């Protein structure tokens, strides 16, 4: 039959209805007084967490990250700029809020590397995402077949190179077909046209 | 009072001194920041891509 996890996963399909909504309205209050990068002891979304790589092991860390809601906090051009490049309000970044979160976090925990991330709500002026990090210098993980690879040197500061899962999704590398002409194998080797 | 010859006479204030880090006389002792190596402002040696031509 259905696992206990499948309940949590279903509840989160509509975070505005039922018990979860009654929960969000509560926590969020306590969440708004909390700092930007806070280390929590256990995943809010246990299912998603596990389904992303989570494990109750030594060297596996989770954390919530709050970011201001909005569009390009872009300063207006000071020198001569033609009508088209005269934007400040409308234009938005080419990097999604979730990815910004992953970085603020990886930085906060220098030595740790980023496994994955996931949304955990949002109100009228901020969005929250939890982050799974791993300590690639801890024998538990160096010995764990299922996470071992994250220790590889060429995995260091991966979130910053866009190597996340949320990264490749942002880079337009989902479909192996139509549309990916300008994105595979990388944006820079395609002249940045996506 | 000209900005020229006559205003050269007051110039006896010290500014850029021997930077401890890079070894240049570019350590502004009033700012305690080097104009060359950036010591005092950045942990990373100040370096810009325009100190040379574009394709170089």
């Amino acid at each position: 039959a259905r696992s206990a996890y499948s309940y949590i996963r279903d509840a989160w399909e509509n975070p505005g209805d039922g018990q979860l909504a009654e929960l969000q309205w509560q926590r969020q209050q306590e969440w708004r007084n909390e700092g930007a990068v806070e280390r929590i002891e256990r995943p809010t979304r246990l299912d998603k967490a596990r389904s992303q790589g989570y494990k109750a092991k030594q060297g596996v860390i989770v954390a919530r990250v709050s970011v201001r809601k909005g569009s390009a906090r872009k300063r207006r051009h000071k020198a001569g700029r033609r009508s088209k490049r005269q934007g400040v309000t409308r234009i938005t970044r080419r990097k999604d809020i979730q990815r910004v979160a992953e970085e603020r976090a990886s930085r906060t925990f220098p030595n740790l590397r980023v496994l994955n991330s996931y949304s955990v709500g949002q109100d009228g002026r901020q969005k929250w995402h939890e982050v799974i990090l791993i300590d690639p210098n801890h024998p538990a993980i160096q010995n764990d077949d299922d996470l071992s690879w994250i220790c590889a040197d060429d995995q260091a500061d991966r979130v910053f190179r866009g190597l996340t899962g949320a990264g490749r999704r942002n880079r337009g590398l989902s479909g192996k077909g139509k549309g990916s002409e300008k994105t595979r194998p990388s944006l820079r080797s395609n002249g940045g046209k996506a | 009072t000209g900005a020229g010859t006559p205003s050269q006479g007051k110039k006896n204030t010290t500014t850029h001194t021997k930077c401890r880090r890079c070894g240049e006389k570019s350590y502004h002792t009033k700012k305690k920041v080097c104009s060359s190596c950036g010591f005092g402002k950045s942990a990373k040696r100040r370096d810009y891509e325009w100190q040379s031509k574009a394709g170089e």
């Binding site: 033609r82 009508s83 088209k84 490049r85 005269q86 934007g87 409308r90 234009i91 | -």
Partner: protein, 92 residues
């Protein structure tokens, strides 16, 4: 000038001379689904948009005759060349 409502002229459809009714071409509505109507929403953005920022030009001192010549038997119409007429009023 004046111009009769119905007169016997040649129609390029049935291939002969019959009675032709003269009516003024009335403007048909735009769907807003054409290609130029999808490009307007596409090419337009921050600042200047090129051709989409061009407002209506102007008027000539006298317009040509925009008409339709509908025949009586078959019911089909035919467009003919226009002449510069300041005003065109039909007789009956």
């Amino acid at each position: 000038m004046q111009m009769p409502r119905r007169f016997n002229t040649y129609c390029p459809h049935c291939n002969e001379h019959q009675e032709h009714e003269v009516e003024k071409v009335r403007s048909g509505r735009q769907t807003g689904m054409k290609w130029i109507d999808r490009q307007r929403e596409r090419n337009s953005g921050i600042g200047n948009d090129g051709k989409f920022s061009k407002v209506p030009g102007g008027d000539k001192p006298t317009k040509k005759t925009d008409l339709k010549y509908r025949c009586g038997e078959c019911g089909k119409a035919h467009l003919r060349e226009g002449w510069r007429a300041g005003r065109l009023e039909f007789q009956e």
